[PDB]
Amino acid sequence: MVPSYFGITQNDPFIRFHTDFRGEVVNTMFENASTWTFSFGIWYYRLKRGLYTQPRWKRVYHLAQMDNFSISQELLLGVVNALENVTVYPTYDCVLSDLEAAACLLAAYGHALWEGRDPPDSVATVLGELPQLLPRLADDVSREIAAWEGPVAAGNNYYAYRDSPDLRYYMPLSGGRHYHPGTFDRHVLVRLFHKRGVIQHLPGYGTITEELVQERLSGQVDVLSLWSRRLLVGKLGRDVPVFVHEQQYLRSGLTCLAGLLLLWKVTNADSVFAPRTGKFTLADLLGSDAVGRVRNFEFLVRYYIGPWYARDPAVTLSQLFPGLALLAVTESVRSGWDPSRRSNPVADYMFAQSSKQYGDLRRLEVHDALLFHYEHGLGRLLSVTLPRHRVSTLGSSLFNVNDIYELLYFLVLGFLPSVAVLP
């Protein structure tokens, strides 16, 4: 009964909810706002139009008024549910989120800077320090890209994973829980972390040294392992995973760092106090009755990410930012890339989540195709000359996002409504 609150933008009040932030915000919008007059952009409309002519999906998603940009609550919840699950690792034995894995890599990175930084005490503290750590990481990445050796992976992507065209599942299956040798060879973060001594021995990356054989023989033994244990023993005790051997945590953690780097880059582009371009107002979401250096990213860290992690430590980056997942997947799809060769993968996963015909394995395969697009699109967006410009272009052309204030809400909601139909 004690209400929960999240803060999205500094110019806005906090948003009240009981247990499910996104679900309750969506429900309030359909109950209090004139949704029939809204647009959610052409990407959402094209999805509605495509489904409208398919009787099964028209019924499941309660589609009505074929030539209206407005979408049903059922369709909106369907899309959002698919996006939220993108970086969820749905195995019975998943003990860490992509966010906690990213926090361990970042604490190890901070220690490896050798600048006398105050050691963080927990994942919550590392999250609190993202506004200080991410600019340093972004500077190091920019230097690593400028001095890049050998070829760049397909799509000018510096954050690429080298998977076989036949790889259909995200879970690592080589020698237990490792990805095939060479999977991380062209990934800028892995190259940087290996250069800074964050990662010392990564199976399938580089060559086995005499020191690994000596460690295996004598037992006399690593920055990543030390920081993973320090941050996660409170949560897991003795059962702390070794990221270099349970590579799903290494890969999800790296993808989450790429996601955080992109969020830090685009969220701080302009002030929420500057004159508005778009038509969205908080009243479109909650109803009329209910309502220097740019630091929009720090505001989200303190009033959204931090409080969510405190109440639900299983939270993943796609559950926090389903709009980021929609942008990244769309960037990959539009580029012509396909994980089956190395098309609506969001809609494909929505269908797999609702249909009783799909077994667990088929649903996982469709989930993993969406996640492969997500990783590729995220890497593409972060690798372009001006990431803000490409994100701005996709936002205004497809997702009804026209300024920084609308971008911030879109990233957190997975959609952006505004009055499109007026007398």
Numbering used by the authors: 1 to 221, 224 to 293, 315 to 365, 385 to 465
Task: Show me the paper's own sentences about this structure.
We also present the structure of its β-herpesviral ortholog, revealing a striking structural similarity to its α- and γ-herpesviral counterparts despite apparent differences in capsid association. HCMV pUL77 is considered the ortholog of pUL25, but despite biochemical evidence indicating its association with capsids, the analogous positions around the penton vertices are occupied by a dense layer of the β-herpesvirus–specific phosphoprotein pp150. Similar to HSV-1 pUL25CTD, pUL77CTD and pORF19MCTD crystallized as a monomer. The striking structural similarity between pUL77 and its α- and γ-herpesvirus orthologs suggests a conserved function, in line with the essential role described for the CVSC in genome encapsidation and capsid maturation. The crystal structure of the HSV-1 pUL25 CTD displays a remarkable charge distribution with a number of positively charged residues on one face of the molecule (blue in S4A Fig) and a cluster of negatively charged residues on the opposite face. A similar but more pronounced polarization in the electrostatic potential was observed in pUL77CTD, whereas the corresponding surfaces of the γ-herpesviral orthologs did not reveal any accumulation of charged residues. The striking structural conservation between pORF19, pUL25, and their β-herpesviral ortholog pUL77 most likely indicates an evolutionary conserved function that depends on this conserved structure. pUL77 associates with HCMV capsids residing in the nucleus and is also found in extracellular virions, but unlike in α- and γ-herpesviruses, symmetrical cryo-EM reconstructions of β-herpesviruses do not reveal any density that could correspond to the pUL77 globular domain.
